Design a protein around this ligand. Structure first.
Ligand SMILES: *[C@@H]1O[C@H](CO)[C@@H](O[C@@H]2O[C@H](CO)[C@@H](O)[C@H](O)[C@H]2NC(C)=O)[C@H](O)[C@H]1NC(C)=O
Lengths: 1245, 49
């Protein structure tokens, strides 16, 4: 087994990725070539890519092929290709392996300018767009906006030219649902990559200062259950301590970090003073619990503490509050888990272990002692216990570290790690047992690396140097080892490392190239041929590469200042090592303060980019195969190993006053300096920008810039004021001068507001370094937005500030909903392609308010579609079994008719080229011949008989009426004859309790007719069939007395189907009623019985059908039992199609397409005709539901409003606010499918 | 998937499109039995809870 090979490839091929596939062969000498290729699966017919690779001693017999699955060459369509063949071919071997492929190619980083918004705002949003390579993707992209109820609200799509996709600013709808909105971003057409982002809509106001609540621990244990200690601090958003606030503490019980409202406390309800930015608080939890509650002990308290805090600035009008939503009471305060720990042993080599001590609130505990018990087995269960080591955690990471110089014979380590904080008992000291296992080589042949498990990350462009040692019985064969370096899923480097004459192997002296800067991975391997048997030997390791960007875009305010004045002209210099695009944004730090529990837009961007790593853990594995799998690789080899045993499991091991501005995109040709004026808002502004280059994305260092002034005013105007109400409006002026001085603010307001002050004032002096409360009492007369200035005319001159009051109507905000399903084909019956909604006015409108109105159209999708079709046997059913006696002519032709109509569905002339096209004229001819034949059998009295002299048959006449009901779709039968036949059949045989009892016809021709359950009340069958025939005739011969006889027969058939009898009767009766009243209550009750009798395969039904009479017996050929089965199922199908219950019909159609009982039925005419009728009606209803509707909505008197091009793609137009006060008429073209549209009307009372 | 199970329709009403499961944000149009008319907003809508 000398001649061997490895081909190694990513565990999954990403669609359109450039994938680097590397081959090594062993024991060849003659220079030879191979091709590596990617081919369609399973057929291997289509080569997606191929690469010729020459292999020689010159190459040390190693090469790679670079191969890419171009997205358009995949067949696509309904079914994505799941799997693909990787192939190798050479003079010496060929093998192919089924790779999975995945379309998750690239990243979609949604950036919204802010984390939260109010109503009456617009969310400026853009997306950064990258391949699996960090290059700009340049892919057209769609944003999907989703409301807090999960309704899709808009799709907007943009062409990427840059890797930056500046979407249109999404105006918040004229009535938003409150809470967390969602945006989902997808590349169009051909990738699964799905970005997601959120924002909350709330009636917020910008907080004036941050309040920070700072518990010592997010838990309370034995130490703190007696008493806990908790700091509070506050700072104005210009980063200065809040000088004075009245602090009120509001403790509560808690039980759930997620959500609860457990009993709020009423004891130790401390009111206290914050000074110089800080208040210190303590809580004797034991005292408070024992005093207030029926709880009295921590044993009763595997639970949580709630606290809310509110603080009032002691000399001003701004007051702010915050909470801690839970501090965990638990006897075990910590939890423990391993980090970066392989669980795979390198025997004799030192085995380091790192273990993290974590809070019950998922946070790092910091400094804690730990001891590690260890037990080892080397060979033949020879068992030895090691001395228990002890350590302490790192004070920041909470990570304790250990190392064991395990025996060179060690085969497994089982070790128990327990927290060693002496103050906790062992039942409360977080403790865990683990097992670590040797590489389990077959030939005692191993590969180890000297990697010192470095806690510090590698520094870009340094020469890494890792020493590697194979050990084996056959080391003098090995001669070299190979290595692979993995970044994301991709083999970015490969090579080989020769044995020195020293019997020492070249180390991995390599630069950590810039493509490695996301934490990367290394795998090393060799094949040794052994005595005669080859073994693949391999090992792998994790390599953290310190997160340095490629661009390293450095951006700084060149006029560096501690704080700028409001409106200060500033020069912001952006410098880059190379030509780069940049996106810039500015957001007020107070907006991050708005969100109770904030987060930044692009935190953790790099760990998100690292999600593309297919491997997991620190490296190693139970085997060569497991080493490759956990490295995220796979391999083809003849060296007696394969990946296939191992599952694709999801491995989870742990390793002017704007609110925002500067929202801009620019080219930085290596350097550009942009000057602009800051806003008038005296706050710290968090300025951020993102460089985008071929090297990849780099989020710049965030710039925080303070806007500050020695003196200013701010006013606590709420988000909105109730109209027509006198209000108290509070503010405070802040003095940062060294000294006090006389200040006044002269307010000035529009006449839409009145105030008792009627503004020049006393001009109070604020003392230095202090704030003075200012309050005005005002009533707003008028709704909407109203301007009010304030001039802080103070020292030697004026000052200016401007604000807009928002005024909301009194009483209640109220709403109504109305809507319809538009139905231009009457799929539900009533054609409903037009509707109108009046300008309705409520009985108690708040007199000056105006009704807001919002229309909301919604598409309705077809869902699943089934390609149930006839074979080329349709041609045999045209030429079908010889016309002649027994009315073998009727048996031949009536299928010709039904085939006619099936083909008339249309597909089977446009597309049928796969098969021989049925000649239109030939089909027509055969149709005509059958029409003449069927006429020939008509009775003179417009009855029918098979025998010329036979009796009238009401049954066969109804069958005639059905068929002749079908024919009219292309060739009408002379309706006079039909009407005469109907009159004969009803007038002769309409009994008044049941109807159409069959005349003394000698027999039913068993293949032409069928066997109903004649043992009981065959009048039920006869009534059903006659009804159905009449239904098919009536549209061509509408007659009032025929209508009446229909009513009678339907009534009898219903009332006599209340007992279930046999399910064939129930199904055919249900179908008859489905032709009648689709919606009668007892009709529906029969349907609910039938749907109970339906057998199903699979919990979600894959197939649904009905059996009776022990038809569960096997039958190799169609028979009368299968005839009954197929008939009753076809009637249930037709009933369900009358219900248009496609989600119910689909598994019935799939069942019917099986042709279980192959040939079907008895192969009777009846079963065949009902089956084809059902298939045609299904394909019809399917193409009816295909949505296409240009719904144009307009006012009655006023103009058009909107014109939704409702399509399977554009299936959901955005909500439109109905501005104008008029009746609304909604309309559509004939179009196709179904849709529904709703207007909501919003009003005040 | 924690969607919505089928709601019981009001008296004399029925579901146009009876299913085992309805999607989040999906609305189900009720309709009234043969003798009856719908009055009010004939759509229920599946909430995320
Ligand atoms: C608030 O201050 C602004 C700024 O001065 C006022 O707007 C100015 O109004 C005068 C006329 O009175 C115009 O000539 C200026 O051009 C306006 N300034 C602009 C447009 O920037 C506004 O009227 C004041 N509102 C009050 C006092 O209620």
């Amino acid at each position: 087994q000398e001649q061997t090979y490895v081909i190694s490839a990513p565990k999954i091929f990403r669609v359109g990725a450039s994938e680097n596939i590397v081959i090594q062969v062993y024991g060849y000498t003659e220079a030879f070539d191979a091709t590596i290729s990617i081919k369609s699966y399973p057929d291997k017919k289509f080569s997606y890519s191929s690469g010729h690779v020459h292999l020689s001693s010159e190459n040390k017999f190693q090469n790679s092929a670079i191969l890419t699955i171009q997205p358009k060459q995949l067949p696509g369509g309904q079914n994505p290709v799941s799997y693909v063949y990787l192939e190798v071919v050479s003079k010496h071997f060929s093998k192919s392996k089924r790779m999975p492929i995945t379309y998750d190619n690239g990243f979609l980083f949604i950036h919204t300018d802010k984390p939260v918004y109010t109503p009456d705002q617009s969310v400026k949003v853009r997306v950064y767009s990258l391949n699996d390579d960090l290059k700009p993707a340049k892919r057209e992209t769609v944003l999907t906006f989703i409301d807090p109820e999960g309704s899709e609200v808009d799709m907007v799509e943009e062409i990427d030219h840059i890797g930056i996709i500046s979407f249109p600013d999404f105006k918040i709808p004229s009535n938003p649902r409150y809470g967390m909105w969602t945006i989902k971003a997808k590349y169009k057409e051909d990738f699964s990559t799905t970005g997601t982002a959120y924002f909350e809509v709330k009636e917020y106001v910008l907080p004036h200062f941050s309040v920070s609540i700072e518990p010592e621990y997010n838990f309370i244990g034995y130490k703190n259950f007696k008493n806990f200690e908790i700091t509070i601090k506050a700072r104005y958003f210009y980063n200065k301590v809040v000088t004075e606030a009245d602090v009120y503490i509001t403790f509560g019980i808690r039980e759930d970090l997620k959500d609860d409202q457990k009993e709020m406390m009423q004891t130790a309800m401390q009111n206290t003073m914050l000074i110089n930015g800080i208040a210190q608080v303590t809580f004797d939890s034991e005292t408070a619990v024992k005093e207030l509650s029926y709880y009295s002990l921590e044993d009763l308290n595997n639970k949580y503490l709630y606290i809310a805090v509110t603080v009032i600035e002691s000399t001003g009008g701004f007051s702010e509050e915050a909470e801690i939503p839970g501090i965990k009471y638990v006897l075990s305060p910590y939890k423990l888990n391993l980090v970066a720990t392989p669980l795979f042993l390198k025997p004799g080599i030192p085995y380091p272990i790192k273990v993290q001590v974590k809070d019950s609130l998922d946070q790092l505990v910091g400094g804690v002692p730990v001891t590690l018990n260890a037990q080892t087995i080397d060979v033949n269960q020879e068992t030895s216990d090691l001395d228990p080591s002890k350590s302490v955690t790192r004070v920041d990471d909470g990570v304790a570290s250990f190392v064991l110089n395990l025996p060179s014979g060690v085969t497994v380590l089982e070790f128990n790690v327990k927290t060693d904080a002496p103050d906790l008992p062992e039942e409360n000291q977080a403790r865990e047992g683990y097992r670590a296992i040797a590489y389990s080589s077959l030939s005692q042949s191993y590969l180890y690396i000297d990697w010192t498990d470095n806690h510090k990350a590698l520094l870009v462009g340094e020469h890494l140097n890792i020493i590697v040692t194979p050990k084996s019985p056959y080391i003098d064969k090995i001669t070299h080892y190979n290595y692979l370096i993995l970044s994301k899923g991709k083999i970015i480097h490969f090579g080989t490392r020769e044995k020195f004459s020293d019997a020492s192997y070249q180390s991995i002296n390599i630069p950590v190239t810039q493509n490695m800067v996301p934490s990367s991975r290394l795998l090393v391997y060799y094949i040794v041929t052994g005595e005669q048997t080859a073994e693949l030997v391999s090992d792998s390791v994790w390599l953290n590469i310190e997160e340095k960007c490629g661009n390293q875009l450095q951006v700084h305010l060149s006029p560096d200042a501690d704080a700028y004045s409001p409106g200060q002209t500033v020069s912001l210099n952006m410098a880059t090592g190379m030509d780069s695009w940049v996106a810039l944004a500015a957001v007020d730090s107070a907006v991050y303060g708005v969100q109770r529990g904030a987060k930044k837009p692009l935190e953790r961007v790099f760990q998100f980019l690292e999600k593309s790593d297919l491997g997991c853990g620190a490296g190693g594995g139970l085997n060569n195969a497991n080493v490759f799998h956990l490295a995220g690789l796979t391999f083809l080899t003849n060296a007696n190993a394969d990946d296939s045993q191992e599952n694709d499991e999801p491995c989870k091991e742990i390793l002017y006053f704007p609110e925002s501005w500067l929202w801009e995109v620019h080219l930085v040709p290596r350097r550009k300096q942009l000057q602009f004026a800051l806003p008038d808002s005296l706050t710290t502004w968090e300025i951020q920008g993102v460089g985008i280059s071929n090297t990849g994305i780099c989020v710049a260092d965030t710039v925080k810039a303070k806007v500050f002034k020695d003196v200013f005013l701010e006013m606590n105007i709420p988000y909105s004021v109730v109209r027509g109400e006198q209000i108290q409006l509070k503010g405070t002026v802040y003095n940062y001068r060294t000294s006090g001085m006389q200040f006044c603010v002269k307010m000035s307001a529009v006449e839409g507001i009145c105030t008792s002050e009627s503004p020049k004032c006393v001009r109070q002096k604020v003392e230095g370094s202090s704030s003075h409360l200012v309050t005005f009492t005002v009533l707003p007369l008028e709704i909407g937005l109203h301007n009010i200035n304030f001039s802080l005319e103070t020292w030697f001159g004026k000052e200016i500030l401007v604000k807009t009051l928002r005024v909301v109507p009194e009483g209640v905000k109220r709403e109504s909903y109305s809507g319809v399903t538009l139905d231009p084909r009457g799929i539900y019956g009533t054609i409903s392609r037009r509707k109108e909604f009046p300008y309705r006015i409520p009985l108690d409108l708040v007199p000056k308010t105006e009704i807001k109105r919002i229309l909301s159209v919604k598409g309705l999708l077809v869902g699943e579609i089934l390609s149930a079709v006839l074979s080329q046997e349709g041609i045999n059913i045209l030429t079908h079994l010889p016309k002649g006696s027994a009315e073998a002519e009727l048996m031949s032709v009536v299928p010709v008719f039904y085939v006619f109509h099936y083909l008339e569905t249309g597909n089977h002339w446009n597309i049928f080229h796969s098969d021989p096209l049925i000649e239109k004229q030939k089909l027509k001819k055969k149709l005509k011949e059958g029409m003449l034949s069927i006429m020939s059998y008509r009775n003179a009295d417009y009855s029918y008989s098979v025998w010329k002299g036979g009796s009238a048959s009401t049954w066969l006449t109804a069958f005639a009426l059905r068929v002749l009901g079908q024919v009219n779709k292309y060739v009408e039968q002379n309706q006079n004859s039909i009407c005469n036949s109907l009159l004969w059949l009803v007038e002769n045989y309409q009994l008044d309790n049941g109807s159409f009892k069959e005349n003394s016809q000698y027999q039913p021709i068993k293949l032409q007719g069928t066997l109903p359950v004649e043992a009981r009340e065959n009048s039920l069958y006869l009534t059903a069939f006659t009804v159905i025939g009449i239904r098919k005739a009536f549209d061509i011969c509408p007659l009032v007395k025929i209508d009446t006889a229909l009513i009678k027969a339907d009534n009898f058939l219903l009332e006599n189907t209340l007992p279930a009898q046999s399910t064939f009767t129930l199904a055919i009766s249900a179908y008859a009623l489905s032709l009648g009243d689709k919606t009668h209550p007892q009709f529906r009750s029969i349907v609910s019985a039938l749907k109970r009798e339906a057998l199903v395969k699979g919990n979600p039904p894959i197939y649904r059908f009905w059996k009776d009479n022990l038809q569960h017996k096997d039958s190799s050929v169609p028979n009368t039992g299968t005839a009954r089965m197929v008939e009753t199922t076809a009637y249930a199908l037709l009933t369900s199609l009358n219900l248009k219950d496609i989600n119910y019909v689909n598994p019935v159609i799939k069942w019917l397409s099986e042709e279980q009982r192959y040939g079907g039925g008895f192969y009777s005419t009846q079963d065949t005709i009902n089956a084809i009728e059902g298939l045609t009606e299904y394909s019809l209803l399917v193409k009816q539901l295909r949505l296409s509707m240009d719904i144009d909505v307009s006012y009655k008197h006023k103009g058009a409003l909107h014109n939704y091009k409702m399509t399977d793609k554009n299936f959901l137009g955005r909500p439109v606010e109905v501005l104008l006060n008029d009746d609304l008429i909604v309309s559509t073209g004939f179009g196709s499918g179904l849709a529904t549209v709703h207007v909501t009307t919003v009003v005040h009372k | 998937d924690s969607g919505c199970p089928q709601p019981v329709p009001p008296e004399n009403g029925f579901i146009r499109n009876e299913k085992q499961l309805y999607l989040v944000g999906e609305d189900v149009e009720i309709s009234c039995l043969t003798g009856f008319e719908t009055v009010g907003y004939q759509y229920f809508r599946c909430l995320p809870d």
